[PDB]
From Swiss-Prot, chain A:
Additional information: Early fractionation of eukaryotic MCM proteins yielded a variety of dimeric, trimeric and tetrameric complexes with unclear biological significance. Specifically a MCM467 subcomplex is shown to have in vitro helicase activity which is inhibited by the MCM2 subunit. The MCM2-7 hexamer is the proposed physiological active complex.
Positions contributing to ATP 2 binding: Y31, K51, S52, N153
Function description: Acts as a component of the MCM2-7 complex (MCM complex) which is the replicative helicase essential for 'once per cell cycle' DNA replication initiation and elongation in eukaryotic cells. Core component of CDC45-MCM-GINS (CMG) helicase, the molecular machine that unwinds template DNA during replication, and around which the replisome is built.
Domain of life: Eukaryota
Portion of the parent chain present: 441 to 774 of 863
Assigned protein family: Belongs to the MCM family.
Domain MCM, residue spans: 18-183
Changes after translation: Sumoylated; SUMO2 modified in response to stress caused by inhibition of proteasome activity (in vitro).
Name assigned to this protein: DNA replication licensing factor MCM4
Binding positions for ATP 1 per the UniProt entry: R159, R232, E235
Motif segment (Arginine finger): 158-161
PTM annotation (N6-acetyllysine): residues: K10
Curated annotation (Swiss-Prot), chain B:
Quaternary structure and partners: Component of the MCM2-7 complex. The complex forms a toroidal hexameric ring with the proposed subunit order MCM2-MCM6-MCM4-MCM7-MCM3-MCM5. Component of the CMG helicase complex, a hexameric ring of related MCM2-7 subunits stabilized by CDC45 and the tetrameric GINS complex. May interact with MCM10. Interacts with TIPIN. Interacts with CDT1. Interacts with MCMBP. Interacts with DDI2.
Any one GO molecular function term: single-stranded DNA binding
Natural source organism: Homo sapiens
Changes after translation: O-glycosylated (O-GlcNAcylated), in a cell cycle-dependent manner.
Domain (MCM): residue spans on this chain: 278-485
Catalytic reaction equation(s): ATP + H2O = ADP + phosphate + H(+)
Full protein name: DNA replication licensing factor MCM6
Motif, Arginine finger: chain positions: 460-463
Amino acids binding ATP: H291, S331, T332, A333, K334, S335, N436
Location(s), subcellular: Nucleus; Chromosome
UniProtKB/Swiss-Prot annotation, chain C:
Name under which the protein is recorded: DNA replication licensing factor MCM7
Chain span(s) of sequence motif Arginine finger: 33-36
Modified residues (Phosphoserine): S20
Lineage: Eukaryota, Metazoa, Chordata, Craniata, Vertebrata
Organism this protein belongs to: Homo sapiens
Full-sequence range covered: 481 to 644 of 719
Cellular location(s): Nucleus; Chromosome
Amino acid sequence: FSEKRVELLKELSRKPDIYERLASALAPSIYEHEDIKKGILLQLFDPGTSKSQLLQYVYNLVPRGQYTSGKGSSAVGLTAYVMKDPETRQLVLQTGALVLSDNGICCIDEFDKMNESTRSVLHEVMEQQTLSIAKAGIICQLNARTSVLAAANHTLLSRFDLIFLLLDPQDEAYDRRLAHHLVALYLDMAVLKDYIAYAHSTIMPRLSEEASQALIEAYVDMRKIGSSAYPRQLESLIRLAEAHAKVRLSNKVEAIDVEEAKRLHREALKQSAT
Amino acid sequence: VRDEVAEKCQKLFLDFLEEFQSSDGEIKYLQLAEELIRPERNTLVVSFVDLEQFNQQLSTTIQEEFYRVYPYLCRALKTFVKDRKEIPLAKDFYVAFQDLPTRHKIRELTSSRIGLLTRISGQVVRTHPVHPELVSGTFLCLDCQTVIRDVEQQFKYTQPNICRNPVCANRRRFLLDTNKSRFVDFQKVRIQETQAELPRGSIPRSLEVILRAEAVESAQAGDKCDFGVDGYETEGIRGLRALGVRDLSYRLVFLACCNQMTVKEWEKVFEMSQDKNLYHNLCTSLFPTIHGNDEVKRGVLLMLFGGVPKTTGEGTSLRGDINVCIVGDPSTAKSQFLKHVEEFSPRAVYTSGKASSAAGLTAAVVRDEESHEFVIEAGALMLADNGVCCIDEFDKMDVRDQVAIHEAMEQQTISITKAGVKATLNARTSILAAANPISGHYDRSKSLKQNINLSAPIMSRFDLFFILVDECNEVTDYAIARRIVDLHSRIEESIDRVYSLDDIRRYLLFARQFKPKISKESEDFIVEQYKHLRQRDGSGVTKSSWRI
Amino acid sequence: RCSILAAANPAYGRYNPRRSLEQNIQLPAALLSRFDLLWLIQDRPDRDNDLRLAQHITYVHQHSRQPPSQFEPLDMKLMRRYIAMCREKQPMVPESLADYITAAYVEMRREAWASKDATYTSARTLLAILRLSTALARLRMVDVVEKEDVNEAIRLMEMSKDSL
C-alpha cells in the first residue's frame, strides 16, 4: 500500500508525455474547450450543454452538498428556514444549504435567472467573504471560504467572480468525437480512495519568494487601458495559484500556466467594447 | 425546616439596618428612607464584605434559596419603618442586593444550577410591552368556598378539585378576584450572549428571563450594565388535564433582579502613554494598503478617537457623532477593502451594511402565542452601539433606508411607533460611510444636477468632505502592487508587537467624570482664524459641495 | 424507471404561425428543451382527409371485422401473449452499424443549424439516434448483413424533422 503509491509517482518520471496525460485522465466526461476543465481543476483542489451534467461529477465525488435554482427554490432553502416541530410544538432554528456549504464546493444553477429583488443574500457573502446569519434573535457570520463557478450573460457588475461566453465554432468534427466516445468506452479507484485523503492530512502549501514578482508582470501590460493593479483579481490570481503547487509537487509558481488564465478573462472582456 | 431559616435571615437582615461605620444612629437609615420613599426610586445595596464577616453563611443561604426567600422578604421587609403609621402609605416596591462578584456564562447555566444568579449581560432583543398577566387568584364561586391564602402561585391554575362545579362547559362565569390579587407583571426579554466572549460560530441560546416592573427600562435597553367517604366513591378518580403542562414545564424558570489593583494598572499604562506621535505609526501599520492620500487616511484615523460633549448646562443636545464623506473610486474595482481594515478593532460591533433580514421597520405584535417573525429592534443602528458602524451597499437608500437613516442622524435615536410601541434610545457611535459616483468627478463642464448621484437630506449632514482627483500617473501606480504582495510576506517582514495599542481607548473611559475645562484663549484663536477660511472659499476655488 | 408520456394543452389559443417560439409561449423554451421529443398537430383545412372520418367513425362496434386485412378474429387475451414471446427472444443489435450512421450525422447537423429557424437541434439528438436503433435493430433477426437500418433510422428522424 505505502510502497505501491510511491511507485506510481516515480513511474511518471520516465514518461515524457505526462504534461498532457494527467489533465486528460481526470474527468474525461467533460466536453471540448478544456479551459473549463482547468477551472474545474482549480475548484477541485444553449444551457445544459454538458453543463447540467457537469454538476453530477462534483455531487458524486463529495456527497455533502445541495442543488438549488432560481424561480424554483424559495429563500427558505438556503437560510431562515425556521419552523415548528408538529410532534412537540416548539420552534426550531433551522438553517439551510449555504450555511452547511462551508468547507465545500457550491453548486448553484441558473445564477443569472434570479430576479433583481432577490439574490440579495449572496451579494453580501461575495463582498464580505463570509456568510452572515440573519435570524430572529441571532445575527452572526459563518465563514464562507469557497468559490463560485457558473456561466451567464448600476455599476454592480463587479459582484461576479467569473464571466464566460460560449461561442459556436461552426465545427461539426468536434461533435463527432463525443458521438464515438459513448460507444468506444463500452488503478483509478486507488487514487480516489486514499490519495485524496492522505495528501489533505498534513500537506500545507507555503508561498515561496520566486512567485512574488510574477504577479507584477500581470498589471504591467494592463497599463495601456485608459492611457491593472487596482482590480482585486490580482489578489484572486494568487489565491488560485495554490493549485499549481499541487501539480508536479513544486512549491514555486512561474508565469507559465498562470498567464493563460489572463487570456480566458480577456476573451470575455474584449467583447464588451466596440 | 424552612421556618427557622426564614425567620433568622429576616432577623439578621433587620438588625443590620444600622451601621457601625458612618457615625452612629439612624442618620444613614434616615438617608436610605429618604432616598427610597420621596423619589420612589427603590434602589438599595448591601456591602458583601460586611455581610460575610458578620455571617458568611448568609450569602450561601440566599444563594441556595432565592426561591424561598423571595416571598418572605416581600412582606416582612416592609418593617423598615418601625411604625404602623407608614405601612399603609406604601403599597408595594422591591429592592435587592447589587455587585454580585461571582458570575457564570449564560450558555452553561444548566437547569441543574437553578437558584444561582448572574449579571444581566448582553443586548436586548425582542422587547415586550408591559402587562399584568395572571399570577395568583381563584376561579371558584364565593358561595361554595371562600378565597384561600395559598393557591396557584405559578402560572398554573387552581390545584384543588373540590366542588366539581366548573367541570361542565355549559356555564359562563366571570367572577374575578380583582380586589385581592397580586397581579403585577412578568416580561420576556431575549437576552443574547456577549459575542466577544463567544467564538465565531456561536448561535447563542437566549434564556427565559423575567424582569419585574422595577426592572422595567431601569437602564438603557439593548446594553450591558457597565458602571370516611361520601357517595361510595373509591380511590382512582381520574380527570387530569394536560393542556397546562406543555407550556411552562418545557422552559427555564428563574427570577432576575437588577486597592493595589488600580495602582498596578496605572503604572504600566500611563507611562507608556507618554510616547509621542503614535498616530504616525498607525498609518503604516493600520493602513498597510494605502498609497498617497495622506489627508484621506488621516480623517479616518482621527475618526477612531472619541469624546462627545454632553449637556450639563441644561441646554440643547450637542451633536457629537462623525459623518465623513470620501471621494474615491468610480464604483469599479471598489476600494471597499478599507472596510476590512475597520474589522481589526475589538470592543466594537461590526455592521454588515444594509443587506439583511431587516427585522425592524416592519415591527408587529409579537404575541402570536409562541412567537413573531418580526422583532422589536432597529438593529440597523442599535446593534452598532459603543462600536463602529459600517454601511455597505449605500445605493440601497431608495425608500425604506432613506427615512430611517435621516431620523437616526437627526435625533441620535429611533422612534419606532406602531400604535402599540413608542420609545426613544441613545445610539452614541460613529457612522462610517463612503459613496462612489457614477463614473467620476467632472463638474467642470457638466452640470452638477443629477451628477453627484447622492440624496440631499443625507449628504448635507455629513461632517467632512474631500477632493480626490485621480490621474493616470504611471510613476506611482507602478509601485502600488509592490506593497500589496507584501501582506503575504510575513516570514521575512513583520512588525514586532511589543505592547498593545488599545490601552489608549480605556483612558477615555475615565474621561467621562473628569472635566477637561479647555482654556478659552486657545479655543477662540482658531475661531477668529476660521473667518479667513470661509472667505477664501467664495473667491473662486474649485467647487465640490456647496456646504461650507 | 418508467416512461413519461406528456400531453400539453395549448395555452388559451391555438399555435400562432406569425409568432415564433420564446415570444408566443411564456414558459421558457429551455424547460421544454429538456424534453427529447415534441409533437404538435395543426388542424389544417384538408377537406379530403376530413371526408374519411365520418365514414370511418361508423365502423367501430358496427361489425365484427375489426382487423380488416383478413385477420382471423382470435381471442382478445392471446393478442398480448403474442407480444411476450417476441420480447423473450433477446436479439442483438449490430455494433459496426454505428460508424456508418456517424458519417450521415455530419450533414444532418450543418443543414439543421444553418436554417436558423424556430426548429433547432443539438447534442441531445445523439441520444435519440442511438435510442432509435433500440427497437429498429431488434426486429430484424438476420445476423449476417445489416444495411437497411441506416435508412430506417433516418426515416424516423425525417418525420420528426421539420415537424414544426
